[PDB]
DNA sequence: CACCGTGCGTGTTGACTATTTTACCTCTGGCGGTGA
DNA sequence: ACCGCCAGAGGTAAAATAGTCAACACGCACGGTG
């Protein structure tokens, strides 16, 4: 996502560091995105969801 | 109470052990903390880590098992 | 306590579809040459 | 005052790239049995 850096680097470069094939890489932003996506983890975060 | 009707998925547990209550088919923590230990054991593919993790969590939140609810939902 | 039999998380292709840019026609403004 | 000419701005093709959807080894790790 680009969160600190200058760049929202693609799946392939993430890849070259991490050493993989994008879908491993994906694989992982996933379980990620669904963690962060709980209640217990994601309320304040919520909070900045304007409705 | 307002916590106990949440379902496990809140609970934050182990991929085994929502398999496990998945077979068991408990929606409520309200229905699972009326259980005790043993039969908890009776539940097939759970042992006791499964079973102390359970403990672990339901203590954090101040919770355990024996209390008797009625009329629940 | 110790040993062996599955379960399951952890790393790996192949085929398919959805952006994204880039280039090719067409409208439609602006513009300047030319004229007692 | 007019009339032929020029360039900036769109709709549709097409190539390139990125994201999306189901199998095989392999090494821990849990459970049965002694």
């Given at each position: 996502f680009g969160i600190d850096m200058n760049t929202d680097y693609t799946l392939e470069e993430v890849g070259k560091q991490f050493d993989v094939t994008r879908e491993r890489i994906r694989q992982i932003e996933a379980k990620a995105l669904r963690k962060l996506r709980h209640p217990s983890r994601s309320e304040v975060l919520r909070s900045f969801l304007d409705d | 109470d307002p916590i106990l009707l949440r379902p496990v998925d809140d609970l934050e547990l182990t991929v085994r052990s929502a398999n496990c209550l998945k077979a068991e088919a408990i929606h409520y923590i309200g229905d699972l903390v009326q259980r005790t230990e043993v039969e908890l054991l009776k539940?097939?593919?759970?042992?006791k880590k499964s079973l102390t993790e359970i403990k672990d969590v339901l203590a954090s939140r101040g919770l355990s098992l024996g209390m008797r609810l009625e009329n629940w939902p």
């Amino acid at each position: 996502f680009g969160i600190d850096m200058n760049t929202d680097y693609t799946l392939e470069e993430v890849g070259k560091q991490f050493d993989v094939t994008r879908e491993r890489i994906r694989q992982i932003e996933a379980k990620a995105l669904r963690k962060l996506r709980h209640p217990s983890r994601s309320e304040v975060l919520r909070s900045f969801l304007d409705d | 109470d307002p916590i106990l009707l949440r379902p496990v998925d809140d609970l934050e547990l182990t991929v085994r052990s929502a398999n496990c209550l998945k077979a068991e088919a408990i929606h409520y923590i309200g229905d699972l903390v009326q259980r005790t230990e043993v039969e908890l054991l009776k539940t097939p593919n759970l042992g006791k880590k499964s079973l102390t993790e359970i403990k672990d969590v339901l203590a954090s939140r101040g919770l355990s098992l024996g209390m008797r609810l009625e009329n629940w939902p």
